């Protein structure tokens, strides 16, 4: 299954490679129970996130669009 | 309050004065239905 979602890279994880940080955040958020629909599986393989990321009012973190592998 | 447990609810940060206004309008027969939207710009 191909899923594209927005990942919130916090300011302290700046200067590291985007892909590893994004996959770490996705694994932390989606390690188990997935979401209510499209399965409850715990599997996740990898991801690739775009370099450019948005900055929103009141938040210093950077929001990147990333496509990733689940194991539904 | 209406949907029970079957619906999903999202947190929104607003002024409590606006919530008071919404509840005072709801004490009337006015029915304000707040429409949520993505916090990110999405695009």
């Amino acid at each position: 299954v191909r899923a594209k979602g927005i990942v919130r890279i916090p300011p302290e994880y700046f200067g590291q490679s985007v892909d590893e940080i994004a996959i770490k955040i996705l694994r932390q958020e989606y390690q188990e129970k997935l979401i209510k629909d499209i399965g409850v599986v715990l599997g996740i393989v990898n991801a690739k996130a775009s370099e450019e990321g948005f900055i929103i009012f009141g938040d210093g973190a950077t929001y990147h669009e990333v496509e990733f592998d689940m194991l539904v | 309050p209406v949907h029970g447990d079957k619906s999903v609810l999202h947190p929104v940060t607003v002024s409590y004065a606006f919530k008071l206004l919404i509840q005072e309008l709801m004490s009337m027969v006015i029915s304000p239905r707040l429409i949520l939207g993505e916090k990110v710009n999405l695009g």
Binding site: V1, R2, R8, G39, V41 | V40
Partner: peptide, 27 residues
Amino acid sequence: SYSLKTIEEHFVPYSIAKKYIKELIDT
């Protein structure tokens, strides 16, 4: 902040699920 959209979804391979979980454990 977390908008999930599934595109071109593929079925979970039962035979290759062991390989996928082994790769995940390796990672």
